[PDB]
Swiss-Prot record, chain A:
This is Fatty acid synthase subunit beta. [Alpha(6)beta(6)] hexamers of two multifunctional subunits (alpha and beta). Belongs to the fungal fatty acid synthetase subunit beta family. The chain holds residues 5 to 160 of 2051 of the full protein. Present with 91800 molecules/cell in log phase SD medium. Fatty acid synthetase catalyzes the formation of long-chain fatty acids from acetyl-CoA, malonyl-CoA and NADPH. The beta subunit contains domains for: [acyl-carrier-protein] acetyltransferase and malonyltransferase, S-acyl fatty acid synthase thioesterase, enoyl-[acyl-carrier-protein] reductase, and 3-hydroxypalmitoyl-[acyl-carrier-protein] dehydratase. Transmembrane segments: none annotated.
UniProtKB/Swiss-Prot annotation, chain B:
Present with 91800 molecules/cell in log phase SD medium. This is Fatty acid synthase subunit beta. The chain holds residues 5 to 80 of 2051 of the full protein. Signal peptide: none annotated. It comes from Saccharomyces cerevisiae (strain ATCC 204508 / S288c). Fatty acid synthetase catalyzes the formation of long-chain fatty acids from acetyl-CoA, malonyl-CoA and NADPH. The beta subunit contains domains for: [acyl-carrier-protein] acetyltransferase and malonyltransferase, S-acyl fatty acid synthase thioesterase, enoyl-[acyl-carrier-protein] reductase, and 3-hydroxypalmitoyl-[acyl-carrier-protein] dehydratase. [Alpha(6)beta(6)] hexamers of two multifunctional subunits (alpha and beta). Belongs to the fungal fatty acid synthetase subunit beta family.
Length: 156, 76
């Protein structure tokens, strides 16, 4: 089957079931991460420390994407799309990353810099992962318009 | 291809691209080394601490050789 990979970051932790086909690559990327990251601080409420696992994996997406190249196919594209799925399943709920950011900002501790870095790296990867946004999602108001339930105008 | 193996010794560090054919053996030899070595000290300027990566790998050669036997062919 597969081997689990723990993304344990001091106060924080998230897991990722990695097929052993690339668990070695994932473990090496972890061997890079655990060094790249700073030390656990006040529950990871620091300048960049991921105060929750969602950003713990957001920074993960950021770096991994940093280690890829879309022009080519690599070994980290697999882990890229993989952790992409796992993140959009665990922390995201079919909604948009912006809703996730707004929530994590509202309920939990808030540092706008991180919560936006979240979308930053999420998107860099989600695209670098060859998963574009050529897929219109079910935005409530927009279908409400498609059905006439609403109506919009754009002011600049 | 291969997996990189970090020979990180506190202040010092050197890497070694190991073909996964024996990256397990290399990682186990590291699991021995990191214990055999003393702790990082004044930038590894101690009695035996490798003050640079060249000696960080010299001691590595020393031990690994200690773990071989020329009369036979081994995994190391």
């Amino acid at each position: 089957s597969t081997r689990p990979l723990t993304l344990s970051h001091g106060s924080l932790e998230h897991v990722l079931l990695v097929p052993t086909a690339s668990f070695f690559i994932a473990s090496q990327l972890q061997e890079q991460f655990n060094k790249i990251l700073p030390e656990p601080t006040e529950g990871f409420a620091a300048d960049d420390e991921p105060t929750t696992p969602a950003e713990l994996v957001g920074k993960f997406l950021g770096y991994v994407s940093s280690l890829v190249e879309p022009s080519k196919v690599g070994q980290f594209d697999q882990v890229l799309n993989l952790c992409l799925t796992e993140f959009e399943n665990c922390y995201l709920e079919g909604n948009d990353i912006h809703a996730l950011a707004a929530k994590l900002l509202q309920e939990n501790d808030t540092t706008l810099v991180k919560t936006k870095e979240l979308i930053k790296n999420y998107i860099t990867a989600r695209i670098m992962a060859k998963r574009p946004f050529d897929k219109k999602s079910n935005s409530a108001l927009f279908r409400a318009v498609g059905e006439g339930n609403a109506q919009l105008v754009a002011i600049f």
